[PDB]
């Protein structure tokens, strides 16, 4: 299975050179073109450039003087570098595969046919801050009848993103993780809740797994199933 993984999300200082890597597994670089495509928050898609392993890269005319890409066939990686970043470069950066076929008198890219999950790059001079995670205990007052809700509050982190799983992914049903609020302080908070049947509550443990890659922090907070 050919899978694409971008290097982890985080901060870059204004004016610095952004450096990203895409690691390809489940097959070799050599068969495909490799591109980077980015998406600023609330905006559309912007192609940055592509490369073939034995060819020369080609870049967007708009980014050409600031970007480069290269391929390392022994680590099976593609890199991106982007000079002089500003807040306009804050975006999700996707590593993107394109198939190669012959048509219209050349070998050509035919389709952006496999996209990575993307890595969120936030351009800021501020420092990172990991989350403080607090348990949200279940209430003995169901409002829907027959169910309890318990959760994790993930407080005051920077930058985005944070991901949350429950019981290492073994718990999925009734899980609801809310998008983060941006506070006036410029920090983020979010919440994740699990709804579970009343009759079911306390028959196992509930652990929220909170991942904040920008600070290389992970928290596993156990929520004791006790109402007050």
């Amino acid at each position: 299975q050919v899978q694409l993984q971008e290097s982890g999300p985080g901060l870059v200082k204004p004016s610095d050179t952004l450096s990203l890597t895409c690691t390809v597994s489940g097959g070799s670089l050599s068969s495909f073109y490799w591109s980077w495509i980015r998406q600023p928050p609330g905006k559309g898609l912007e192609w940055i450039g592509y490369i073939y392993y034995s060819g020369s890269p080609n870049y967007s005319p708009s980014l050409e003087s600031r970007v480069t890409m290269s391929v390392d066939t022994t680590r099976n990686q593609i890199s991106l570098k982007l000079d002089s970043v500003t807040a306009a470069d804050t975006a999700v950066y996707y590593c993107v595969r394109a198939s190669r076929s012959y048509y219209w008198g050349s070998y050509r890219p035919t389709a952006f046919d496999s996209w990575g999950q993307g890595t969120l790059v936030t351009v800021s001079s501020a420092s990172t801050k990991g989350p403080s995670v607090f348990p949200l205990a279940p209430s003995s007052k169901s409002t829907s009848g027959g169910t309890a809700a318990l959760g994790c509050l993930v407080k005051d982190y920077f930058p985005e993103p944070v991901t949350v799983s429950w019981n290492s992914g073994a718990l999925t049903s009734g899980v609801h993780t809310f998008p983060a609020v941006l506070q006036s302080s410029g920090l983020y908070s979010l919440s994740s809740v699990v709804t579970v049947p009343s009759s079911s509550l306390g028959t196992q443990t509930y652990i929220c797994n909170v991942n904040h890659k920008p600070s290389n922090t992970k928290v596993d907070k156990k929520v004791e199933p006790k109402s007050c």
Binding site: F112, L153, F178
Partner: protein, 208 residues
Amino acid sequence: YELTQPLSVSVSPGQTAIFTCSGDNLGDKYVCWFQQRPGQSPMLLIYQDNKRPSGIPERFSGSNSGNTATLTISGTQSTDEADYYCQTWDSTVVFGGGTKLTVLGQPKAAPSVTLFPPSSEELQANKATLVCLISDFYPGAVTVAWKADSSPVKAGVETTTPSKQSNNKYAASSYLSLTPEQWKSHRSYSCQVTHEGSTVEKTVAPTE
């Protein structure tokens, strides 16, 4: 070179949604289409005008000739709600600005509201956050106000814009930051959620 796509397209449930993408002599080029569901990576739907990769059902089809390319979704479902991008190559890669698909004719749904008091661990850290989680509402717009006892609170409130959940209803959250002393000082706090002209309120009070 530019590709022009409308900002949004809407459809009633189970029926046919048509997306247009225009550009000068677009028919001379090959067009691809991508779908991007909220909070996910784009995914290829159509390549070379009308070909489907294996995971794309036959109810998606593409066409391209003259100055216009189209994407057609038949039997459209709420879970097809997404941004749809067209794309081509003209000396360089060009993406359209994207079209947001809304599936209308959905029944209204009142918000479910869950309000959590500050945890004991947070209070011991000398902080206090009330958490008002709001889910399962349609249409996707609410306003949220807070009260300390019966009085309006302005300071310390942070509220998200609503976002789509997986069952196709919407969710939002709102937070009230207090000092431990403010939390313990009042008889109660309430999160009031207004949806389509009517309001649900939940209340919590210091315990233990």
